[PDB]
């Protein structure tokens, strides 16, 4: 078996993209060589003599199927087998065919959906396509479940009369395309009461497993054509096999060698790195409200916070924000103190002009500083609009991670296109987990190629696309190439502030030429190209190095006294000990700290009683 070539599926709903010639090219681009439409299938405005010899591979539509306003005569949806009907058109249907006539009543004529058997959800609509015969013969009781047989609306009228009668080798007047190959195959309304699901025959011995949607090949659940609920890499389960089983004898769970993490609508051995692994085995996009992310174990689990935890706000495109296009003026209030965004960011030029359709007034430019709190984002970042007054992306100077969970067009996490921006300004960016980045079309931007995003892409297959920006030769020759002394392999701004890759070293948020070893005011050491100050108690070494770590334990020589392994400023004189007994010490010859006589309560300046008078 091989993974079926998926396509994202359009969502335009009767909107024409460009010219009649070009609208068809868009269709030719999205649905070419596609076998599983992950979204919706919309075939609109296809004009006469335009072929559709690429629609003969779609085997499954996960949303709805809209066929309207066409004029071509043969829309060959050949191998379509099931319309899962997740979404609906007009909130009712999962297959609409509407008003396919041209000017002189010569619209769609041959719609040979012979392999279609099942519609898991929704009704069907056929309307005002006056040149459509040969589908009135189909029986819509086998197709649609018994639940929706009331919502269904059908209308067929071929007033012309050039309707060919079809081959009599199949069900009473039931043919999709005129012939013997293209007539209906009933698999629900022909079988005895002893079957529940589909049934490939009238004999009680050829019944299909209830976890099969269109039809089966044998009697098992591994013999379906398309799986109804899940897919355990060989068969159509109903729920992914649990990770741990509970035996009712010893009253405790037990590992399961068949358990699979339930990701998406499949069962997998393990989940991708950027997803929230639950204990059930589920792999979610955003853990519960009370909970909050974990960091490691190789995965990204979610623990339960300790009360008031980092406020996260559902970004655009989820739940409360599905009616909203971008961050309007209205909906900007709820982004006050969100630390992370479980979602993705749409920055659309409608959020700066203010449309009267959604009754939304224009947004104000300085409001964008509310986004100075966020630190990472789960889905994608989509930047298309920005006030020309500002020279860089200021509201995003805290972001360090881009998870890219629900990416854009299924491809893009970062998308910075066609802006009057002169600097990206990403002094905080540390990784882009998944997706792709398109830094293209910006008027200036300049510093964009000298970043080496390859060091920011955690997963594989990710690619960048950096074109149509002010070339370096036209910007580097105008005093804009970034600063030196900071390992020039990376700069999100002209000053050395950012400089991804910090020279050979760095002093926190800034790059430097070398750590303060040997000399300098604060003594330092080097690990991972970072300069950390020594403990104040290490002696300034004018010869060799000073320390080999942060703690006073790694000093080469203490500045004052030495209490064992540690370098102390003054020997302890009141520190809590065992049995509630205080602790007093003294400095001897080599400034070493030794304990007082147990008796000496007021401390001691020497060993034993010969050290403390009182």
């Amino acid at each position: 078996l091989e993974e079926k070539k998926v396509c994202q599926g359009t969502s335009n709903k009767l909107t024409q993209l460009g010219t009649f010639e070009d609208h068809f090219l868009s269709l030719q681009r999205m649905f070419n060589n596609c076998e599983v439409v992950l979204g919706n299938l919309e075939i609109t405005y296809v004009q006469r003599n335009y072929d559709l010899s690429f629609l003969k591979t779609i085997q499954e539509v996960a949303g709805y199927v809209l066929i309207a306003l066409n004029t071509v005569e043969r829309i060959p949806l050949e191998n379509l087998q099931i319309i899962r009907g997740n979404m609906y058109y007009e909130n009712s249907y999962a297959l609409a065919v509407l008003s396919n006539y041209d000017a002189n009543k010569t619209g769609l004529k041959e719609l040979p959906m012979r392999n279609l058997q099942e519609i898991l959800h929704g009704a069907v609509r056929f309307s005002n396509n006056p040149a459509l015969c040969n589908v009135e013969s189909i029986q819509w009781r086998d197709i649609v479940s018994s639940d929706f047989l009331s919502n269904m609306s059908m209308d067929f009228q071929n007033h012309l009369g050039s309707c060919q009668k079809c081959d009599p080798s199949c069900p009473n007047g039931s043919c999709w395309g005129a012939g013997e190959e293209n007539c209906q195959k009933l698999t629900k309304i022909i079988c005895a009461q002893q079957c529940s699901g589909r049934c490939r025959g009238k004999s009680p011995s050829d019944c299909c497993h209830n976890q099969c949607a269109a039809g089966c090949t044998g009697p098992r659940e591994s013999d379906c054509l398309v799986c109804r609920k899940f897919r355990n890499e060989a068969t159509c389960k109903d729920t992914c096999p649990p990770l741990m089983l509970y035996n009712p004898t010893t009253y405790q769970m037990d590992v399961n060698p068949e358990g699979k993490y339930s990701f998406g609508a499949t069962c997998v051995k393990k989940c991708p790195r950027n997803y929230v692994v639950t204990d059930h085995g589920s792999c979610v996009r955003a853990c519960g409200a009370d909970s909050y992310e974990m960091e490691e174990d190789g995965v990204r689990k979610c623990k339960k916070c300790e009360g008031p935890c980092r406020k996260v706000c559902n970004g655009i495109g989820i739940g409360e924000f599905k009616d909203s296009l971008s961050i309007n003026a209205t909906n900007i209030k709820h982004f006050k103190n969100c630390t992370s965004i479980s979602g993705d960011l749409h920055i659309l030029p409608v959020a700066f002009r203010g449309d009267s359709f959604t009754h939304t007034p224009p947004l104000d430019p300085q409001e964008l500083d509310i986004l100075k709190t966020v630190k990472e984002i789960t889905g994608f970042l989509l930047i298309q609009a920005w006030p020309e007054n500002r020279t860089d992306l200021h509201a995003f100077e805290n972001l360090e991670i881009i998870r890219g969970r629900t990416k854009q067009h299924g491809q893009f996490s970062l998308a910075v296109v066609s802006l009057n921006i002169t600097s990206l300004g990403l002094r905080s960016l540390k990784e882009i987990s998944d997706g792709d980045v398109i830094i293209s079309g910006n008027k200036n931007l300049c510093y964009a190629n000298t970043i080496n995003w390859k060091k920011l892409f955690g997963t594989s297959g990710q690619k960048t696309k950096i074109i149509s920006n002010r070339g370096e030769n036209s910007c580097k020759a105008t005093g804009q190439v970034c600063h030196a002394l900071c390992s020039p392999e990376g700069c999100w701004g002209p000053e050395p502030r950012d400089c991804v890759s910090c020279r050979n070293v760095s002093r926190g948020r800034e790059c430097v030429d070398k750590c303060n070893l040997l000399e300098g005011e604060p003594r330092e050491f080097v690990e991972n190209s970072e300069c950390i100050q020594c403990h104040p108690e290490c002696l300034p070494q004018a010869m060799n190095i000073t320390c080999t770590g942060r703690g006073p334990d790694n000093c080469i020589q203490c500045a004052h006294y030495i209490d064992g392994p540690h370098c102390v400023k003054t020997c302890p004189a009141g520190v809590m000990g065992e049995n509630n007994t205080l602790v007093w010490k003294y400095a001897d010859a080599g400034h070493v700290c030794h304990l007082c006589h147990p008796n000496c309560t007021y401390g001691c300046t020497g060993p034993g009683l010969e050290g403390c008078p009182t």
């Binding site: 709903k13 009767l14 909107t15 460009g18 893009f412 079309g441």
Partner: protein, 47 residues
């Protein structure tokens, strides 16, 4: 064509039209911009 109740409905210089049969309104997005109302830029093919 669309009455001014739907003015400015089609973003990015849309050409809002009226489908006679269905009794519905819809956009005529410029090339390179997609979506129900010409909102998004077709990133997958150009800049």
């Amino acid at each position: 064509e669309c009455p001014l109740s739907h003015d400015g409905y089609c973003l990015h210089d849309g050409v809002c039209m009226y489908i006679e049969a269905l009794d519905k309104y819809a956009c005529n997005c410029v090339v390179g911009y997609i979506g129900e109302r010409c909102q998004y830029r077709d990133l997958k093919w150009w800049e």
